[PDB]
Amino acid sequence: ELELDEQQRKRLEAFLTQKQKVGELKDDDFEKISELGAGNGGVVFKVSHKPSGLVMARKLIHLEIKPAIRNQIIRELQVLHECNSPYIVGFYGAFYSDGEISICMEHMDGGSLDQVLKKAGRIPEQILGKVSIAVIKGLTYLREKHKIMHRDVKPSNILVNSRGEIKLCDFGVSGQLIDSMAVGTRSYMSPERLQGTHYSVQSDIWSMGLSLVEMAVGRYPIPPPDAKELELMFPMAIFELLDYIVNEPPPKLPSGVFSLEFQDFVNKCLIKNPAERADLKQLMVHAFIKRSDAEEVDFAGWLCSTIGLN
Ligand SMILES: COc1ccc(-c2cc3c(cc2F)ncc2ncn(C4CCNCC4)c23)c(Cl)c1
Ligand SMILES: [Ca+2]
Ligand SMILES: [Ca+2]
Ligand SMILES: [Mg+2]
């Protein structure tokens, strides 16, 4: 899982070689190309780094804070330079300028999976098999190589591109940034996290499981759809919704339309007891993942056709 093929090794080396040419990121060295979309507490733009000519994704987080606080956030974000993986979005740098922190990243031309889902309606099982592999490996990388968990897996934090790559972003690195921003949705949080009890990487596995169900059925799955709505397919307030997650049984895929391997996979992800819930090691050898890994699915081609990359 941690071991890479030669295509992934070549691309990661190519990213770093280009990154070494960039140097120190400055506010005036960026030109706006387009707005990509309003995300977690800030607007993300597609931008050109004028000196290097590199296209980037730039998230601007508007905050009014003193030089002490903001300079601590920039040094905390420097660990993202070390997070080098085919399943983690590339980091160029971070800086402060005129009342707003900037985070500059690798541009992913396919966007996030909430955008792809909204375009697709629902995502096919075999496509979600490749999504599952990438999230597991991305989470395995952060945990093994950095002793880090994500803390915020959701469709908007899974980015994709026309080269067929699927990557994670917005994992917890800066404690001070979360303090100063305090925001994001808690609707993908695990029941034990919403109860404020012993939570770990198992909490991200729930979030993946729930995200996969949403992408599979084409709708955030809590509360469950009706028997009539499932036939048509194939309002709770946020506080009422978070109480439902803690108190009611977990969501499941509908039977018949998905394979029992995929149903079992998401079920093992959504067991409410984190001890009983499957771990990354167990999920990596799961029947769904083994089958998915063997399947030669053209994700890039599927993506481009679905979102209209001409
Ligand atoms: C650390 O915090 C982040 C998180 C994500 C990105 C990020 C977003 C992108 C992107 C690349 C990226 F690195 N590429 C294409 C694209 N299209 C739409 N979006 C966003 C629209 C709002 N919803 C979330 C995705 C993005 C950045 Cl820069 C910083
Ligand atoms: Ca300026
Ligand atoms: Ca200036
Ligand atoms: Mg977040």
Swiss-Prot record:
- Write out the tissue specificity statement of the associated record: Widely expressed, with extremely low levels in brain.
Mutation effect (residue 181 to W): Increases interaction with KSR1 and BRAF
Record note on modification: (Microbial infection) Acetylation by Yersinia YopJ prevents phosphorylation and activation, thus blocking the MAPK signaling pathway.
Class of the enzyme per the UniProt entry, highest EC level: transferase
Q: What is the effect of changing residue 180 to A?
A: Loss of catalytic activity. No effect on BRAF-KSR1 dimerization
Q: Which disease is it linked to?
A: Cardiofaciocutaneous syndrome 3: A form of cardiofaciocutaneous syndrome, a multiple congenital anomaly disorder characterized by a distinctive facial appearance, heart defects and intellectual disability. Heart defects include pulmonic stenosis, atrial septal defects and hypertrophic cardiomyopathy. Some affected individuals present with ectodermal abnormalities such as sparse, friable hair, hyperkeratotic skin lesions and a generalized ichthyosis-like condition. Typical facial features are similar to Noonan syndrome.
This chain belongs to which protein, by name? Dual specificity mitogen-activated protein kinase kinase 1
From which organism does this entry originate? Homo sapiens
> Its encoding gene is what?
MAP2K1
